[PDB]
């Protein structure tokens, strides 16, 4: 009965973790931020509309200069735009048109993309020949590649549908580290501001915090009733927010090791596709399947406002590094810049 | 007003726009088919007939019509995370082996392959992303099914079967049960064809069914339907 005794030991350890979490929960987040002023009403207008994609847009990512942004759509084209002038800087044809994620490097020299081909492609932007070339293809995942984020020009972290994350050295195309522990398909990841830790949300309704160097799972966070489609870190790095299919967003804290806040409304039954924070972290922006985006007071869980400008599902959204604008990309083949 | 480099950047952007519009038109003129079915149900034979890890993507051209066909059988991940990517396909080609009417699943004991293919067909046909999409159903291995139907009756799979062990009655029964798994009879049509060994009547059947689907789509666009 070696199998059963370890199951009882696992249940005992889960009981110990739950009791230790209940011990350190003297107050709630709502009880402390009950005295701060509400943010009012947030009315953001569509400043720019980026047109050109002919199919559903599945991902976008801002450059670190806050002016250039790559967008991935399933027409088989990565477009790199200039947000200020709505000019197309680059159009990159993809070998596989079934793309689900895109990333733009912090140096600005590379973009990445991947999807149902189980391959993360790294494209060089600053080439002597004047075009955009495939610099690297990273293969080794056995499921669809759902998210990718650059650490620097040589390292990238990918999440996949084979329930595993991976840290890759780009110049040798090898998986330096493999992160395992999730039992369902990992749908998103997010890097900390120091890029020492990253969080990942999977289809087992759980989020795992991972050390990048030592390759281990530090903490596991539960609470969601369905698949965690999106995840995003708090700007200090001590908290993250998850968007799931049970129509709720949740704010977890790494140091208290439990859920701090739930963002939900009875009007909203559709699942969340994307989450992000504002530069101060006061606003939490979430894209939904009801074709809209909601802006939540992240300290008070009130709906501060609505971004309503898309005719189909808001599939992706991002906030610039200076916090000047929010880009929303959607299944109706348009991106919109809001401020 | 713009500077010289701004004007040249706008001109580069408009050249990119024209290349995007041409590639979009060329993509629009092609036919996209999603290939589904149980493992070892004759999908590979279908791919070999049409041609003459990750997502396999097969191109062919028939009677000046281009076809992309997407095989997603190697995806072991959960289907509802990525099936919405195929929302705008022209048709779904679903392969069902008839000879599996008596073969138990090798992964799960005491579960039949034919019931598993009926459950997969019921999941796909009634999926919320494929309400209007039509299904071309291929019943493969009909000669092996005719060999098996003489010794092994259909009653071990369908106990409510009231017909005889002849080929045509049993094949019609399996076809009727697959077509009555269609809940949305009005919005979509199901086309059913039996396997042909080197006759090449399957590329022709796909061509005819896709032409019918394109005619119905044009009738819906023009407001007549």
């Amino acid at each position, epitope marked *: 009965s070696e199998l059963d005794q370890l199951r009882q030991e696992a249940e005992q350890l889960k009981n110990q973790i739950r009791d230790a979490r209940k011990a350190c929960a003297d107050a709630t987040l709502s009880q402390i931020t009950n005295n701060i002023d509400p943010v009012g009403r947030i009315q953001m207008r569509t400043r720019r509309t980026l047109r050109g994609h002919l199919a559903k847009i599945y991902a976008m990512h801002w450059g670190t200069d806050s002016r250039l942004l790559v967008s991935a759509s399933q027409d088989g084209k990565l477009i790199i735009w*200039d947000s200020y*002038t709505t000019n197309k*800087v680059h159009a990159i044809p993809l070998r596989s048109s079934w793309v689900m994620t895109c990333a733009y490097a912090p140096s600005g020299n590379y973009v990445a993309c991947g999807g149902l081909d189980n391959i993360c492609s790294i494209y060089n932007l600053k080439t002597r*020949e004047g075009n955009v070339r495939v610099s690297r293809e990273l293969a080794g995942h056995t499921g669809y590649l759902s998210c990718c984020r650059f650490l620097d020009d040589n390292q990238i972290v990918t999440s996949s549908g084979d329930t595993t994350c991976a840290l890759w050295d780009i110049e040798t195309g090898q998986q330096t580290t493999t992160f395992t522990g999730h039992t369902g398909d990992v749908m998103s990841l997010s890097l900390a501001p120091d890029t020492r830790l990253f969080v990942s949300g999977a289809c087992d309704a759980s989020a795992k915090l991972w050390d990048v160097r030592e390759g281990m799972c530090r903490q596991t966070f539960t609470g969601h009733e369905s698949d965690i489609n999106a995840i995003c870190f708090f700007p200090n790095g001590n908290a993250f927010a998850t968007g799931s299919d049970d129509a709720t967003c949740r704010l977890f804290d790494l140091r208290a090791d439990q859920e701090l806040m739930t963002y939900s409304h009875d009007n909203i039954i559709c699942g969340i596709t994307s989450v992000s924070f504002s530069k101060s972290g006061r606003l939490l922006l979430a894209g939904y399947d009801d074709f809209n985006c909601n802006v939540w007071d992240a300290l008070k869980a009130d709906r501060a406002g609505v971004l309503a400008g898309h005719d189909n599902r808001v599939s992706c959204l991002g906030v610039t590094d200076d916090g000047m604008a929010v880009a929303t990309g959607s299944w109706d083949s348009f991106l919109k810049i809001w401020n | 007003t713009l*500077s*010289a480099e701004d004007k*040249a950047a706008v*001109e580069r952007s408009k*050249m990119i726009d024209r290349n995007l519009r041409e590639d979009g038109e060329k993509a629009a003129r092609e036919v996209k088919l999603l290939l589904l079915g149980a493992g070892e149900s004759g999908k590979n034979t279908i791919v070999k007939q049409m041609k003459i890890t990750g997502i396999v993507e097969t191109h062919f051209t028939f009677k000046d019509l281009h076809f992309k066909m997407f095989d997603v059988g190697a995806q072991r991940s959960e289907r509802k995370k990525w099936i919405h990517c195929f929302e705008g396909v022209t048709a779904i080609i679903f392969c069902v082996a008839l000879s599996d009417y008596d073969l138990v699943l090798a992964e799960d004991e005491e579960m039949n392959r034919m019931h598993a293919s009926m459950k997969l067909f019921d999941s796909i046909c009634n999926n919320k992303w494929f309400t209007d999409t039509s299904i071309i159903l291929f019943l493969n291995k009909k000669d092996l099914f005719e060999e098996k139907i003489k010794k092994s009756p259909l009653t071990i799979c369908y106990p409510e079967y009231a017909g005889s062990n002849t080929y045509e009655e049993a094949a019609a029964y399996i076809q009727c049960q697959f077509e009555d798994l269609n809940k949305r009879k009005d919005t979509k049509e199901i086309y059913t064809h039996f396997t042909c060994s080197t006759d090449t009547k399957n590329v022709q059947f796909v061509f005819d069914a896709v032409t019918d689907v394109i005619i119905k789509n044009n009738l819906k666009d023009c407001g007549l339907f």
Partner: single-chain antibody, 235 residues
Framework: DVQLVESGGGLVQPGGSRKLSCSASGFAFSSFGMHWVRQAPEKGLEWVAYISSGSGTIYYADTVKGRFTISRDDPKNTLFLQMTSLRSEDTAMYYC??????????????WGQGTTLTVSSGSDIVMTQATSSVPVTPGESVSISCRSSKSLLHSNGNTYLYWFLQRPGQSPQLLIYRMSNLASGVPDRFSGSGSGTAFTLTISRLEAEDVGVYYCMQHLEYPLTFGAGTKLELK
């Protein structure tokens, strides 16, 4: 590697015609706009013509307007300058220069070797390089000054001033693009500081391969105009 090779020069009787060609290899030629820039032998660089990528925009200098015709053939990767009614002033060495234009790009980054053409016998921005020659020794910082008649700072925040170096016997090489940005392959000791109409190029810790003629060019408005050039020499 990137290569532009010019051909078609020689000796032409005045009033005649000639056709220069520039063959491109090693880069995506149809995505670059191309320029012809001449250099009369004693004098400095002078912009001649420009054809955009996709041939949608063509510009000429006023002293070659109506006589010269620039064209490109993109499947053969070739640039043509058909020159008629050749005068004595047309005698010069001609360079094809590639330049691509998007956000953050570096125009004028590669220059061809040039072909020699010998002919026997008002609102333009004026760039002024006041000092023609400067004597310098290695290891010493040096400043090169350029002055523009019009403010080169646009309303979008860009200042359109370019710095080129021509080593003796070689084609010009891009050093600084858009006043403060340094070019690919250029050492970090070069720096560019400008305030609207006055510009400075600083060379800290000068080496033996820094001698030659330094040109400032504006790219705010067509026609593109160069400075007269400031020469650095040893001792």
């Amino acid at each position: 590697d990137v290569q532009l090779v010019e051909s078609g020069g020689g000796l032409v009787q005045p009033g005649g015609s000639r056709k220069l060609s520039c063959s491109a290899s090693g880069f995506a030629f149809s995505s670059f706009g191309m320029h012809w820039v001449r250099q009369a032998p004693e004098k400095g660089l002078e912009w001649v013509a420009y054809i955009s990528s996709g041939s949608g925009t063509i510009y000429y200098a006023d002293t070659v307007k109506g006589r010269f015709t620039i064209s490109r053939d993109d499947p053969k990767n070739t640039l043509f300058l058909q020159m008629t009614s050749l005068r004595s002033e047309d005698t010069a060495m001609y360079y094809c220069v590639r330049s691509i234009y998007y956000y953050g790009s570096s125009p004028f980054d590669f220059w061809g070797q040039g072909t020699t053409l010998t002919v026997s016998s008002g609102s333009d921005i004026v760039m002024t390089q006041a000092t023609s020659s400067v004597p310098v020794t290695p290891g010493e910082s040096v400043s090169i000054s350029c002055r523009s008649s019009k403010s080169l700072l646009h309303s979008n925040g860009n200042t359109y001033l370019y710095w080129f170096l021509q080593r003796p016997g070689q084609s010009p090489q891009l050093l600084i693009y858009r006043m403060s940005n340094l070019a690919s392959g250029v050492p970090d000791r070069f720096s560019g500081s400008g305030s609207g109409t006055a510009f400075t190029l600083t060379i800290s810790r000068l080496e033996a391969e820094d001698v030659g003629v330094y040109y400032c060019m504006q790219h705010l408005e067509y026609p593109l105009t160069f400075g007269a050039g400031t020469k650095l020499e040893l001792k």
